[PDB]
Amino acid sequence: MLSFQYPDVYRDETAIQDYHGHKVCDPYAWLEDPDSEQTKAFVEAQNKITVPFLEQCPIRGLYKERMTELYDYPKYSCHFKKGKRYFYFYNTGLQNQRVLYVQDSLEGEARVFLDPNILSDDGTVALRGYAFSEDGEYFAYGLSASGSDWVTIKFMKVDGAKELPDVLERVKFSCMAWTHDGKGMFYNAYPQQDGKSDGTETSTNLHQKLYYHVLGTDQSEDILCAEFPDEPKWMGGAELSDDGRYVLLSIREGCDPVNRLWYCDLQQESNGITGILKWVKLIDNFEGEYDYVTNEGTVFTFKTNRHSPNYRLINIDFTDPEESKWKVLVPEHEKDVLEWVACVRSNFLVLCYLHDVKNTLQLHDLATGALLKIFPLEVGSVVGYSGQKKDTEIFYQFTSFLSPGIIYHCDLTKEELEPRVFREVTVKGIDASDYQTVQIFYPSKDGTKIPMFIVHKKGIKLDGSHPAFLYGYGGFNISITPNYSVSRLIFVRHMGGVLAVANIRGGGEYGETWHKGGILANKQNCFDDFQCAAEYLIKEGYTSPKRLTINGGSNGGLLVATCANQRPDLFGCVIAQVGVMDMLKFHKYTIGHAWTCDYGCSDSKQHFEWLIKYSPLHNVKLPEADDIQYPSMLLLTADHDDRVVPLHSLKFIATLQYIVGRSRKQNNPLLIHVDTKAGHGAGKPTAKVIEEVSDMFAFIARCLNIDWIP
């Protein structure tokens, strides 16, 4: 098949670093500089071979045409109310960015409120965060360009959708919260730094501070309200209590699901917000997570994991704050994870649980925590919710593997609560009834039972003949729950494929114990779990190694790259998106310091010894057996991915092509595609999403020689 040559790539054989006596050579360290002529030429040369490979075969166009047809369906978010108006997001089908609409009543005619598509023709300027004033009359929103995490905050008056002059720069990883007097808004920003701040730099992000912006002033006038000069990794996010009386500051240091919780009683400020607030350090350690739900006077309800790995609700009275005095409002469940909680209609709580990787939704009494109502759902996920304390209704959106899903509405003023379908769209071209979703539990190496969803055409024979696409993430307490993907359903229907999603350890599916089971010294459990998922699909006859593709992104990109090194015999194709590949250096760049809770950090001798065993960049090795080569691999990244800097994928592909690609037995391609004007993924325009899925499935089809099934 391979009718191209890999690019010349210089090896700096002098690049050696000692880690606690262990010498590590890094011959492609120069690819860490995105701005050099050398790195730019590398990217150019790699794209020059990848693009013709992906575009050459007619199946890419067949896939793209079908994706363009099938993805063209109306896409709505839940309605939410702010002040006297309702809002929702809506994409007519193929707009690059969804549009924010407003109406003056649920009966009322909608109009465009914010349309990001007119901000850039290629749709690479996207909304990233927003906050309405308490009265709903003013609106702040973040914009990111080219997929960067950097944000510019802009402002509008809601009535008439009027642009205001206020602009806030240097915003990243920011909360936004208006004080209820309508004077101004809390937000986070970083200090000025040398070099670029556009998403193409690798500079580490430290010393984030909390500011207050008074509407109608220049950013230079903003008040510094909190800073942590002795703790450069701390990040303090502010929110207002539901009654507007207290600023609650949640301080985090990295990815650990824990936070400090400080508060400021605004009534006690000497003269309004004029400098560092009189913070009361209610919870002044990183031992537990405390997520504000609501308060009634000084009694504050928090969702917490403090000695409760599946989470629970507690009340802390600010007048009697010692731990032995806290009240348990809704105890921890033995198995089900309490995912989130909202307070609505003054004295209702909405609780969303995860029960064996499917969501349930119920209403509880605020005063006692008693269960009041179960909202019936099919098997799938709750992916949207609206309803705050002053609201008298909820909206929530359900989705699953086989249907775009349903938006429900429930009027909570009625004696008998009757949720009703509010919006439901069906995708013509896909008949959900032709397919089924099953959940199985398979044993990992150490015997732990791991959940997996499998989606396939009804009545297939389990004879190993089918292409399969196995997805995993496995980290950061993230649960991978059912979601709707037209792109994956085209693989099922038009490529005869089987979809699988493995809920491996490191995730949040079974609470904090599931997370801890796949981090730090136990990170290898993630990889073992995922390899065991592949073995299950093979043994049970869904697929065979030569027909199996694995995919993951970010921490999931690390997952599939590691699995390619550890078990190249198990996979036909590997697609690693925006992956962390250099586990010895990840903490040096942008926000990578925040991932040490899951990975550790190479500065520690103990951690180095875990990391070096699985780091993809440091474990590329020719398979011993003459009859085994590496799977076909495709790495996808982009030049403004400032979440996972692209050097990770650049150095990894250079290493793959040199160590493995040069071998005579290697006939499967090892390729990278580096996109422009894009980043880690959030906010990617529809046009780019379509190109990306078309590339992925064309790669699979070509490498595995799969015929299109029209």
Side-chain angles (χ1 to χ4, degrees):
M1 178 163 72
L2 268 41
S3 51
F4 58 79
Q5 181 179 5
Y6 291 126
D8 297 339
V9 183
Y10 180 73
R11 294 173 55 82
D12 176 12
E13 310 274 17
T14 77
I16 301 168
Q17 184 172 162
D18 179 274
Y19 295 83
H20 332 267
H22 302 272
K23 295 301 194 296
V24 174
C25 304
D26 202 31
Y28 306 114
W30 56 267
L31 286 165
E32 294 157 6
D33 183 1
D35 298 314
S36 70
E37 294 307 312
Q38 295 91 332
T39 295
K40 290 187 291 175
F42 175 91
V43 170
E44 268 289 293
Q46 290 294 351
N47 282 341
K48 179 178 175 63
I49 57 162
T50 298
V51 169
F53 187 87
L54 299 173
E55 289 184 344
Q56 223 144 30
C57 299
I59 200 163
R60 187 179 187 279
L62 285 174
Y63 185 102
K64 176 177 162 168
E65 178 177 38
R66 197 73 184 129
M67 174 75 180
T68 298
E69 183 177 357
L70 291 181
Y71 198 45
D72 185 3
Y73 63 94
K75 294 139 198 194
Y76 288 95
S77 80
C78 284
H79 274 54
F80 57 95
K81 200 179 183 177
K82 294 289 184 173
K84 68 178 60 164
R85 305 181 181 82
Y86 289 86
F87 298 83
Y88 59 97
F89 291 92
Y90 171 51
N91 187 325
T92 54
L94 292 173
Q95 299 180 280
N96 280 327
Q97 296 295 335
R98 65 192 190 156
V99 174
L100 179 53
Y101 290 79
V102 62
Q103 47 198 233
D104 294 321
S105 73
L106 225 49
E107 303 201 73
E109 166 189 295
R111 68 196 170 265
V112 171
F113 183 71
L114 181 70
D115 180 357
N117 297 288
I118 62 189
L119 304 178
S120 71
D121 290 339
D122 56 7
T124 55
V125 176
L127 181 62
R128 190 189 294 268
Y130 58 88
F132 285 83
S133 63
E134 175 66 14
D135 69 1
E137 299 297 354
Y138 284 86
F139 173 75
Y141 58 101
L143 296 176
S144 288
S146 290
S148 175
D149 282 324
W150 285 113
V151 167
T152 296
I153 300 175
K154 295 190 190 193
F155 290 80
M156 294 161 72
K157 183 166 85 161
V158 174
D159 195 340
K162 308 287 197 169
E163 282 178 47
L164 301 177
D166 304 62
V167 174
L168 314 173
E169 304 291 356
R170 297 172 292 278
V171 176
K172 200 184 225 200
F173 310 124
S174 181
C175 290
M176 298 188 206
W178 291 80
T179 44
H180 292 202
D181 64 357
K183 185 171 186 173
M185 188 185 86
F186 291 102
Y187 72 101
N188 298 103
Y190 285 88
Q192 292 278 176
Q193 72 178 177
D194 286 331
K196 284 183 286 177
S197 294
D198 64 356
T200 63
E201 83 282 358
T202 64
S203 313
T204 188
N205 300 121
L206 301 171
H207 289 288
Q208 195 199 56
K209 306 175 196 280
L210 176 73
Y211 291 98
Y212 185 70
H213 179 63
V214 172
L215 195 68
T217 67
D218 293 338
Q219 183 171 27
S220 61
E221 308 173 53
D222 289 1
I223 306 305
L224 177 65
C225 295
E227 58 170 354
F228 320 103
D230 300 326
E231 294 289 1
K233 299 180 295 180
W234 289 13
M235 295 165 66
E239 65 191 306
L240 275 296
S241 61
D242 292 340
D243 56 18
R245 178 169 187 168
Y246 299 90
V247 186
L248 310 166
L249 187 70
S250 298
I251 305 174
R252 305 191 135 85
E253 171 161 54
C255 52
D256 230 61
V258 294
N259 58 285
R260 284 182 193 220
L261 195 300
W262 301 351
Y263 69 86
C264 174
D265 180 349
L266 289 166
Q267 188 231 256
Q268 289 285 117
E269 287 298 310
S270 289
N271 197 31
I273 297 168
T274 62
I276 303 293
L277 301 180
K278 292 180 210 180
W279 297 108
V280 181
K281 307 187 177 181
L282 177 78
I283 307 295
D284 202 27
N285 61 60
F286 291 125
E287 297 172 28
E289 190 165 81
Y290 300 86
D291 285 353
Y292 172 73
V293 176
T294 192
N295 66 294
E296 289 294 337
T298 58
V299 178
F300 275 69
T301 298
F302 292 97
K303 181 179 68 81
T304 185
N305 58 17
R306 176 69 166 182
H307 295 295
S308 47
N310 298 329
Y311 297 80
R312 72 181 182 175
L313 285 173
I314 60 168
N315 287 164
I316 300 177
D317 192 334
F318 285 5
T319 67
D320 193 25
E322 288 173 35
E323 185 174 2
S324 74
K325 308 292 252 303
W326 302 348
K327 302 202 173 314
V328 184
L329 186 65
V330 178
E332 185 191 14
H333 195 266
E334 267 168 0
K335 189 151 146 307
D336 298 342
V337 176
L338 180 54
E339 287 212 314
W340 56 262
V341 183
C343 176
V344 63
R345 206 216 66 174
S346 296
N347 61 352
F348 286 151
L349 296 174
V350 173
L351 281 68
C352 182
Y353 282 95
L354 196 69
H355 175 73
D356 288 321
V357 207
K358 310 152 240 163
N359 283 134
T360 64
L361 203 300
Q362 54 208 237
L363 196 72
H364 290 238
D365 174 57
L366 172 60
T368 61
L371 172 66
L372 297 179
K373 178 80 184 152
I374 289 156
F375 297 109
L377 298 168
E378 303 298 337
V379 299
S381 303
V382 173
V383 292
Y385 163 86
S386 75
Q388 51 201 153
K389 196 177 182 77
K390 75 175 159 172
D391 289 319
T392 58
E393 67 202 318
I394 59 172
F395 292 84
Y396 51 96
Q397 184 164 17
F398 170 82
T399 189
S400 70
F401 288 117
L402 297 181
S403 131
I406 293 184
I407 296 165
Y408 298 91
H409 176 243
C410 185
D411 174 0
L412 301 171
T413 64
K414 292 297 172 75
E415 291 294 321
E416 291 312 307
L417 303 178
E418 296 185 18
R420 292 177 177 267
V421 168
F422 189 78
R423 303 194 175 270
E424 186 177 15
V425 301
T426 269
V427 170
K428 304 219 316 179
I430 305 287
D431 182 350
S433 302
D434 293 331
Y435 312 98
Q436 73 182 81
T437 294
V438 304
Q439 181 174 57
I440 61 82
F441 303 81
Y442 66 90
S444 191
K445 182 175 169 185
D446 71 9
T448 297
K449 302 298 307 274
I450 312 298
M452 174 159 60
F453 292 114
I454 306 171
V455 180
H456 60 80
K457 183 179 173 70
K458 288 171 169 172
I460 60 165
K461 279 143 44 202
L462 297 184
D463 61 4
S465 66
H466 317 285
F469 182 99
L470 168 62
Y471 181 86
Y473 182 79
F476 299 93
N477 205 214
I478 302 296
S479 297
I480 311 300
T481 59
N483 61 96
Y484 185 74
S485 171
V486 161
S487 65
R488 291 169 181 179
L489 296 169
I490 294 170
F491 173 75
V492 177
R493 167 56 182 82
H494 292 287
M495 294 170 64
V498 169
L499 176 61
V501 171
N503 294 107
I504 70 184
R505 285 173 289 180
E509 291 89 341
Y510 294 106
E512 187 58 18
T513 59
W514 203 243
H515 179 220
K516 285 188 176 38
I519 69 173
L520 303 172
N522 306 326
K523 184 68 187 173
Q524 184 63 40
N525 286 344
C526 300
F527 312 129
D528 293 342
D529 288 349
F530 199 62
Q531 291 159 28
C532 290
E535 288 195 14
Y536 176 98
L537 294 173
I538 295 159
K539 191 266 181 169
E540 296 300 330
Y542 292 90
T543 194
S544 298
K546 75 178 185 198
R547 314 187 181 271
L548 177 58
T549 295
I550 53 175
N551 172 242
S554 203
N555 175 68
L558 163 61
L559 173 72
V560 305
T562 292
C563 288
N565 283 335
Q566 290 189 353
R567 292 294 309 271
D569 64 300
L570 204 51
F571 313 109
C573 190
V574 176
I575 298 174
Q577 294 174 264
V578 298
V580 190
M581 307 304 188
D582 188 337
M583 298 302 300
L584 308 180
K585 295 191 183 185
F586 71 83
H587 58 284
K588 297 185 166 279
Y589 310 113
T590 65
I591 194 58
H593 64 78
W595 312 328
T596 57
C597 90
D598 260 46
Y599 300 140
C601 177
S602 65
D603 287 352
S604 156
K605 174 154 162 44
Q606 182 191 21
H607 297 186
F608 175 83
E609 300 289 347
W610 307 330
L611 291 160
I612 197 58
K613 288 185 182 195
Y614 70 82
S615 182
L617 176 61
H618 304 97
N619 285 281
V620 178
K621 186 188 70 58
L622 281 177
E624 302 209 336
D626 290 345
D627 67 339
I628 302 178
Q629 60 178 302
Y630 268 51
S632 294
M633 304 184 65
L634 177 63
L635 307 188
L636 302 178
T637 186
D639 63 2
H640 292 70
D641 186 351
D642 53 359
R643 183 78 55 92
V644 173
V645 287
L647 63 91
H648 283 285
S649 286
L650 309 186
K651 296 205 298 172
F652 189 49
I653 199 71
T655 302
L656 290 166
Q657 293 175 356
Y658 179 78
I659 297 299
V660 180
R662 291 186 305 162
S663 68
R664 296 212 180 77
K665 69 175 175 178
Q666 184 63 34
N667 289 116
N668 293 333
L670 307 164
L671 301 172
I672 184 165
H673 181 243
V674 185
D675 194 23
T676 50
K677 294 194 81 183
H680 202 54
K684 188 170 285 191
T686 298
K688 281 188 180 294
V689 168
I690 293 175
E691 292 310 308
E692 174 165 276
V693 296
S694 297
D695 287 344
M696 293 174 59
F697 290 97
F699 186 72
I700 294 166
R702 180 175 190 168
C703 290
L704 311 184
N705 207 8
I706 297 169
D707 278 343
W708 183 256
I709 305 174

